[PDB]
Amino acid sequence: LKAQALAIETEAELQRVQKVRELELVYARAQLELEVSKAQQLAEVEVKKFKQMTEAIGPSTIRDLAV
Amino acid sequence: LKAQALAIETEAELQRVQKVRELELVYARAQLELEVSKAQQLAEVEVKKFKQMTEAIGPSTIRDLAV
């Protein structure tokens, strides 16, 4: 009888944990997408800032300005 | 009689542990997939940032700018 009651409570618990972890997986995937969009857009504006600045100053000036 | 009751409780426990570990394996696999997607997308945006920056500055400038 203990085995039967354990079977019932185990089946209910496993259905719950399955649904919870499935929706948690979907929301973590959406957080991943928003994170990588943030990272690539900030990286792109950093690259554009550096490129226009080192174009405006010229590489020959920074070749001997750091030393 | 102790052997028979041990057989019943052992069979119930092993069915429970089998189902629990199977769904835990599936969810750990899904976490692995999301992790490797995160790692490769952040690595790709890092590589693109470094490549465009070292293209904008030129390798001859960084050849003697670090020393």
* DSSP track, chain B: -HHHHHHHHHHHHHHHHHHHHHHHHHHHHHHHHHHHHHHHHHHHHHHHHHHHHHHHH-HHHHHHH--
Q: Which residues of A touch B46 (CB under 8 A)?
A: 43
Amino acid letter, A8: I
Which of the 8 DSSP states describes residue A55? H
Q: Is A12 at the interface with chain B, CB within 8 A?
A: no
- The set of residues, in sequence order, having a beta carbon less than 8 Å from that of B46 and lying 6+ positions away, is A43
Method: cryo-EM
**Which tokens in the block code for residue B29?**
């696999």
DSSP per residue, A10-39: HHHHHHHHHHHHHHHHHHHHHHHHHHHHHH
Compare all CA atoms of chain A with the CA of B58 and give the residue at the minimum distance: A59
**Residues B63, B65, B41, A37, CA torsion sign:** negative
Q: Are A7 and B12 in contact (CB under 8 A)?
A: yes
Q: Establish if A47 touches chain B: CB-CB under 8 angstroms.
A: yes
Which residue among A51, A55, A63 places its CB closest to the CB of B65? A63
Cβ contact, residue pair B34, A28, below 8 Å:
yes
- Put simply, whether A1 touches B (Cβ < 8 Å) is no
Q: Of A65, A63, A50, A67, which Cα lies nearest the Cα of B60? A: A63
Pick the closest to residue B11 from A10, A16, A13, A15 (CA basis): A10
Torsion of CA A11, A14, A19, A21, to 10 degrees: 180
Reduced to 3 states, what is the DSSP secondary structure of residue A64? helix
Helix (H) or strand (E) holding A49: helix A2-57
Largest distance between two CA atoms of chain B:
86
Closest CA to B38 of A37, A3, A8: A37
Tokens of B3: 């052997």
